[PDB]
């Protein structure tokens, strides 16, 4: 199904402030890819968002209850699986 | 329905329309006579025809930020709403 190097899906856009929901079932620790150990979304790490043929890159800026949207906290105050990603650049053809 | 069709107005707040993307999802291309335009991008424009004249607007928010309050309580798994801000209109 979902290929390796999978983290989540975009659920909110505010121009240059993306919010991502982690779709990993559990064990947010050492998702092995290509025999090398990378960690699930962390403050200093990058992410990649492929759009058809070009890949948008971004950097995580906030993790936890801060990245949760406005009224999602109102609906439930105990759910925190969001990250806030800020776009940086893109890779062309 | 005819081509160049996106969704339906479901809210109005003077100058901040909230629009619902329709059920025919996963497409996200919406081909219109050759070239296809991605649906609900941040910078894209929209057109709302009222009888004889058209109303234009610019998208500002996409996703869970545009959906109203009660719908999220009804279902938090659905985010197919956009926030259109009016700009101008085309006369006769």
């Amino acid at each position: 199904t979902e290929a390796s190097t999978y983290i989540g899906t975009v659920q909110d856009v505010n121009g240059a402030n993306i919010r991502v929901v982690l779709d990993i079932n559990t064990i947010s620790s050492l998702k092995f890819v290509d025999g090398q150990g990378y960690r699930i979304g962390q403050i200093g790490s990058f992410v990649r968002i492929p759009i058809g043929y070009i890949n948008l890159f971004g950097i995580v800026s906030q993790v936890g209850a801060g990245a949760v949207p406005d009224k999602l906290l109102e609906v439930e105050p105990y759910g925190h699986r969001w990250i806030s990603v800020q776009l940086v650049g893109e890779e062309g053809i | 329905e005819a081509s160049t069709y996106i969704g339906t107005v479901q809210d109005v707040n003077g100058a901040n329309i909230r629009v619902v993307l329709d059920i025919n999802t996963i497409s996200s291309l919406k081909f219109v006579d050759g070239q296809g335009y991605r649906i609900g991008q941040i910078g894209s424009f929209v057109r709302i025809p009222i009888g004889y004249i058209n109303l234009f607007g610019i998208v500002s928010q996409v996703g869970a930020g545009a959906v109203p309050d009660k719908l999220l309580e009804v279902e938090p798994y659905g985010h197919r709403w956009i926030s259109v801000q009016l700009v101008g209109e085309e006369g006769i």
Binding site: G52, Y53, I93 | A2, S3, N24, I26, S27, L29, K30, F31, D33, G34, Q35
Partner: protein
């Protein structure tokens, strides 16, 4: 009035990278021409086949002139249709004034010659067909990729077998492989399984006795149902219906390569499908000047969702324009390389 190649290439790259939207193909006689094993291509074109039949065989040449009175330069399909019509009439030998059974001998001879000329194997693993087969296996799409062909050889089948590509051509069975028609319309096929339809038939078709049940298998001597449509009172009809039904799928895309749009039924079906579904898109790819395709330019002017690509001309959205020769994608090998690069 001026079009950019890079924009269209990027559009196509984005299109092919998608997974859910259905995809299809059409492989015409111009595709095997672009692959050569000897100095000449491994399989000749339609004109080459007609010339070979003409010079390989005054009574024989009468038929060619007889058909030319009401039609342009006859081809293989026209000659075969005329022979079928002659065999339909019992005492039809008076038109050619040559007995009443030489027509059957000529039909057997031409069928054997065509089978001998076409029963060739594609050499090397670097053929574009293998590249396409690998590209199909690369992305596990939600909807499988269908393939339509109007050729007579079995190059696509062999390429699919070589790279372990499951498919289903409407035939089930190991020895006789009878035609199953209920499972085609039922259409609960495996998701990973692809489909391949040969619109003009191939060498593996054989017609049975008065039972007339159609079956596929090892070709037999003096028997080849390579007839394009022939006549009846049929697989061809259900294949056309399958193509039309696919063209009605939401956001469906169909790609043509090496096809000169010379046929009339295919063009009519494509026009009807384009008019019926406003979201379908067709990529007409050519390897010549667009002035050679009158029907294609007429259809591109009539329809808005049709895109044409030629060596030096292109029609996009009812507006003919010029490139910024160009469009090296017309060649089949370049298309295969593009697909392989997209997969990788």
């Amino acid at each position: 009035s001026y079009y950019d190649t890079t924009q269209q290439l990027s559009l196509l790259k984005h299109v092919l990278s998608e997974d859910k939207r259905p995809i299809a193909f059409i492989i015409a006689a111009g595709c095997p021409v672009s692959i050569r094993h000897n100095d000449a291509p491994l399989i000749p074109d339609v004109a080459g086949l007609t010339r070979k039949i003409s010079d390989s065989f005054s009574l024989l040449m009468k038929i060619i002139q007889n058909l030319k009175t009401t039609i342009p330069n006859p081809t293989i399909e026209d000659i075969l249709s005329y022979i079928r019509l002659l065999q339909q009439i019992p005492m039809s030998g008076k038109i050619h004034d040559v007995e009443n059974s030489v027509i059957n001998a000529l039909e057997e001879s031409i069928c054997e010659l065509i089978e001998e000329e076409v029963n060739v194997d594609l050499p090397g693993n670097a053929t574009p067909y293998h590249k396409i087969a690998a590209w199909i296996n690369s992305i596990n799409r939600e909807h499988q990729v269908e393939i339509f062909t109007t050729n007579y050889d079995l190059l696509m089948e062999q390429a699919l077998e070589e790279l372990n590509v499951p498919y289903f051509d409407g035939f089930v069975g190991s020895k006789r492989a009878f035609f199953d028609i209920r499972t085609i319309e039922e259409n609960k096929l495996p998701s990973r399984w692809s489909k391949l339809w040969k619109l003009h038939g191939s060498i593996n078709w054989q017609l049975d006795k008065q039972t007339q049940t159609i079956w596929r298998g090892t070709p037999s001597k003096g028997c080849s149902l390579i007839h394009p449509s022939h006549l009846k009172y049929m697989p061809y009809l259900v294949m056309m219906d399958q193509l039309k039904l696919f063209l009605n799928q939401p956001s469906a895309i169909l790609i043509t390569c090496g096809y000169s749009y010379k046929d009339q039924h295919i063009n009519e079906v494509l026009s009807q499908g384009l008019q019926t579904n406003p979201n379908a898109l067709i990529y007409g790819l050519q390897y010549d000047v667009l002035e050679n395709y009158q029907e294609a330019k007429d259809m591109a002017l009539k329809r808005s969702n049709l895109i044409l690509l030629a060596k030096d001309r292109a029609i996009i959205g009812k507006k003919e324009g010029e490139w910024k020769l160009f469009f090296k994608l017309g060649d089949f090998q370049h298309l295969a390389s593009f697909l392989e690069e997209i997969s990788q």
